[model samples]
Target chain A: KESAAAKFERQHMDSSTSAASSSNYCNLMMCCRKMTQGKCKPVNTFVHESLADVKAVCSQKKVTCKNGQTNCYQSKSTMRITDCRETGSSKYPNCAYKTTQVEKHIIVACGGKPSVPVHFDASV
Target chain B: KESAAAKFERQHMDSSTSAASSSNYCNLMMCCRKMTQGKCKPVNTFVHESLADVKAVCSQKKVTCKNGQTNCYQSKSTMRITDCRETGSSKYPNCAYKTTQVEKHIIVACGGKPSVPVHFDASV
Candidate 1:
């Protein structure tokens, strides 16, 4: 079974692609990441940063999660990110997405030994 | 603590509106249902069927879940549903959505005493 931290990385981390230049970035990446398997994932963010850099956010400012959990943290600096959102035409087995690039401070839930990002909370 | 069945109902049931007539249906209901509080839920489905009817689906055709669980069941009949998906520009605190209404056979993960829908698996 895939751990939560590993799943988070597979879904959100994209260091190689510093920027999404193609209009089809979301459509391609969303499928490649397997988020469009059973159903389309409506919204997702791809962080263009080193794994080490993102991991360090676990030690940053602590914050409250949406569910009121206190294990969430925000990054100290803004990072490059690509937001993938499902288009209205998206349907199962044929998922489609719109990609929007932005620079924002990320928030994530962290846990486990040595503490790492367990969930991608949001980008602001 | 909210039970899984209760949370599923709160998040997925919307029997009052038979069909969505407004472009703002997704926006209003997503927030009204508290899905856009801290962070927007990526994707969700609202079944415009009575609680009793939706609950009865647990006794329908048994199916496998995306996670490979066999507790899932498929409704015998098609249902009225609205798929709420985040827009590309949608951000937290002001979550935006694109609503697409479709009629399909509903799938749900069912369990517990008397057997009730615990999760919205898919619509096929």
Candidate 2:
């Protein structure tokens, strides 16, 4: 089985290949990462920043969680990212994704041992 | 700002509805939850299971992190969830998603004071 941190890296973490250069990033990643195991992971974001920089977000400006929780934080710096979406024409097993890249401030949920983030909330 | 826990509830938590019986669950939720604010959140998920059950997963079965961090876990029971995907026909802000439902064990990254989950790693 995969660990929490490993799972995070698989689904949300990505510090290499800032450019989807070929647009095949999602198709390759979503499959290689096994996000398409039983079903296609329709949408997902991959941060192009280093893991350490991403973790530092936990201590950034605090903000309201989308669900109205009070433990969310908005990053002070903008980071590069890739957006992966499953193409409408793609079906099960043959999942394919359209990739796009952007830079934005990210909002994240923070709490836990050492106070590091455990989830990738959103990018704004 | 949202707490890490709150972010989890927003991006991944869902207990009020089940069965995308209408097939519009993703379309309605992605927007209602503000995931479609600036740009359409191409893909996302809402779990219909209870928070406690989801949290208990931290102790269910230890697993390797997808990135090989050795700090993640897998749920002991299969859970109910809704997956939202943006349709290719949809444009930014007007993002549309196809709704889907499934039952599967979830994997998450966990660490912190109480050791609660802060992200929705994946459903498998």
Candidate 3:
């Protein structure tokens, strides 16, 4: 069983490639990450940042969570990210996506031991 | 055209209901937000927290973005969030989603003069 933290890593963490220079990036990743299994993931993001760097956000600052829990945080710097949207022609087991990279800031919900990340809220 | 920030707000930000009592929340919301058009979105999140609190994350801590960029932030607090996953039986036009609320930190990419959120990277 995958924990919430683990799920977060699978869906959002992707620091291996900094300069994803190809449009095939999303098409390849959507399958490689297993996001293509069962059904296509309509819209997803793959951060080309390191896991450790992404975690550092926990101690950055304090803010109210979307639910008003008050344990949310945002990064103090901009980041490089690739947006993946399922191609209109996509089909099961053969999912396709459009990739676009950009720089922006990130927001996350943190909790638990080591105060690790638990969920991806939004990006700006 | 809807900016990434506005799209993020529509897809992920939902602070009105903290306890989201029924699964219908997603069914109603997926359509309310127009995520059910064309096809069902595989997975998505809705923050039960406040907009102001979620926005305050920009002033938080700084970290490297996934692509090794320098502008990213995280919250120092936990947040209430809802996860919406499309049900296996779901099909286009009549999409169904499972709603689960939890507390966690969120990661987002931020940019702009007012420092608005542009995308939802992940939640942890």
Candidate 4:
């Protein structure tokens, strides 16, 4: 079984390269990330920062999650990120996406032993 | 602390009314549901089905969650639902949304003593 921390890494972490210049970034990454299986994930984010930096965010300024949970934290510095949103015409089994790259502070929820990021909350 | 089941209900269930005809439904409900507090939730779905009916999906058809968790289930029947997606121009403290109504099979993660829906996974 994949731990929440590991799952978060699989879904959001992409430190090796940047996709800012690629219009097809989302269309390809969403599938390779396994988000386009069964049904297209409506929205997702990929952080182009080192895993250590994202883990560090688990100890940053505490904040509230979208569901009102207080276990979330916001990064102190801006980071490179790409947001993958399903296009208006996207349909399951033939998933499509629109990519938007930006530099912004990120928010993530943390938990478990060593307290790593368990969920990618959002970017601001 | 809110239980997962309760949180799921608060975030996804809207059995009393339908928002199919309201263009501003997402704008209003996202606020009222507390999804736009600290930051705007990028995407969300509200099911226009009874709590019992939605809970019943927990036992319909077992499936894998996005992260490969086997606790998820898919509804046997299509359901009326409204998807609330944040607009590209949306920003915090003044969240904006676009409402989309559709009928589809809902997928949810389930848990607890009585085995009820605890997370809204997706709509197929």
Candidate 5:
């Protein structure tokens, strides 16, 4: 079963109006399995970005899949550059390549490990 | 206020016996503001793994900071290698460096945006 976060994520990303539920995900995944050979890999990635309004961005959510780089695999926490294959050689679509667009964080000037961590749960 | 997920994260990492509460976090963060210089950046990261037992890992939670990689920044969804600095050169401690240690996923031969994104919400 997909985690709640995943389900929550799927709802918004997979379909703007319809949120993905665990059960539907399970059923859909099964169908996906049948549609394709038993060779497919699922990819998910995300980056917290403030592009215009959050709602507007979500409304037009799409994995960038054009030019040299296409379609983004995103999850609530991380995102990866990804793609799919139909050789029936692999299972699920696969994460072919990715670049860690590292979070541009400003750190203390001193030389030592910062006592506090860069929190992920905070509302940006 | 921190997100519910973050509060859940703090409780386990800050102290084994205590979970983080939104209010406590707010106060603690506020206190953190006063105790140190105004420069501090929080770092957070996570890699879902099977380390003995989830409870044990949680019970003995801690941010690494002694050796080269002293403490770890982790979340229910992601993790990053991190450190803290005083004089708070930066608003938060900074993320010095990291190696994705990318997941070893297998992809198919065909090419296109990996149709099905890698599903992160799935329990590893």
Candidate 6:
């Protein structure tokens, strides 16, 4: 008899940490942050929050951030910065440069919210 | 185990058809119509109900009056529907839409739930 909000919240809110205790899995919630502003964007909408499969993937190192790569918030020294665009020349020819933040249940893996974003790349 | 509502609405109190199945999916709880409205202006927010891993491939079946293709209705018929985009352009879209339905387990599903998204395209 879980309430709609609670159920939705369970799927949408928990960080891999809290979810681990409850769902026995991790729900990695990776988001963007402005390095300079230290701004954190917690994927707030259903688009970014949909739990496609079992919440247990986090339990399997499914969504692990690649090695040597840390966020500016964690340990900037180990972080990797990637910038991409649709226009301009070929300082970097490829139109996109996506960085992977590994997660398993994410077998289906990546997506976005609002949730459908175009900036990830036209062919992200 | 105990489902939470009768526990929680027993909160929103929306009217439904049956005895509520899983504490699972069946969310969106609303808005799966108006195929003509493409999140508005790329350019805008599509709504809460859906999300697709952008960094991947797709399965769009032409225009999508045919989605991002309509469900509650049809004419995801993108003829005059540049409207699904800043205008309607689900490079790739798929089945499923919203429902007053409340089966909420969102392990998710083929097109609408879970993740990957009907191969639902984002920026990828």
Which of the CAPRI classes, incorrect, acceptable, medium or high, describes model 6? incorrect
How well is each residue in B1-124 modelled by candidate 6, as lDDT tens digits? 2232121122122233233333221222212323223432132112122122211112232122212423111112121000012223222233222222223211110132222221111111
lDDT at position B121, candidate 2: 26
Point out where model 2 deviates above 4 Å. A114-124, B1-124
Error of 2 at A120 (Å): 35
Better candidate number, 3 or 5, judged by TM-score: 3
Recovered native contacts, candidate 4: 0.00
Better of 1 and 5 by TM-score: 1
Give the per-residue lDDT digits (tens) of candidate 4, residues A25-75: 888888987988888998888889898887887677777777877677777
lDDT-sorted candidate list, best first: 1, 4, 3, 2, 5, 6
Instruction: State the lDDT of candidate 5 residue by residue for B1-124, as single tens digits.
Output: 7743344344213322222333234234323433223433333222233222222322233444333343333223322111122222334433222212222211111111112322222210
Clashes of each: 0, 35, 65, 0, 62, 49
Which whole-number lDDT from 0 to 100 does residue A16 have in model 3?
Answer: 80
Residue lDDT tens for model 3, B18-122:
856686888878888888888898887777788878776656766667766655567668678777889988987678899877787766556642211222434
Between candidates 2 and 4, the lDDT winner? 4
Model 2's DockQ score: 0.08
Best by DockQ: 2
Model 1 backbone overlap count: 0
lDDT, residue A65, model 5: 31
Per-residue CA lDDT of model 1 for B3-113, tens digit only, reads 667778878889889988787899988898889887999887888989888777776677777677777777788889888889998988778899988888888877634
Tens digits of per-residue lDDT, candidate 1, A1-124, equal 8767778888888998899868899999999889988889999888898988888877787776766676777779988888888999998988889998988888887765221111111111
Q: TM-score for candidate 5, please give it.
A: 0.16
By summed lDDT, the worst window of 10 consecutive residues in model 1 chain B runs over B115-124
| DockQ value of candidate 1 | 0.01
lDDT scores of the candidates, listed in order: 0.76, 0.71, 0.71, 0.74, 0.28, 0.23
DockQ values for all predictions? 0.01, 0.08, 0.06, 0.01, 0.02, 0.04
- Residue B49, candidate 6: Cα error in Å is 24
Misplaced by over 4 Å in model 1 are A113-124, B1-124
TM-score of chain A of each: 0.89, 0.81, 0.77, 0.88, 0.21, 0.17
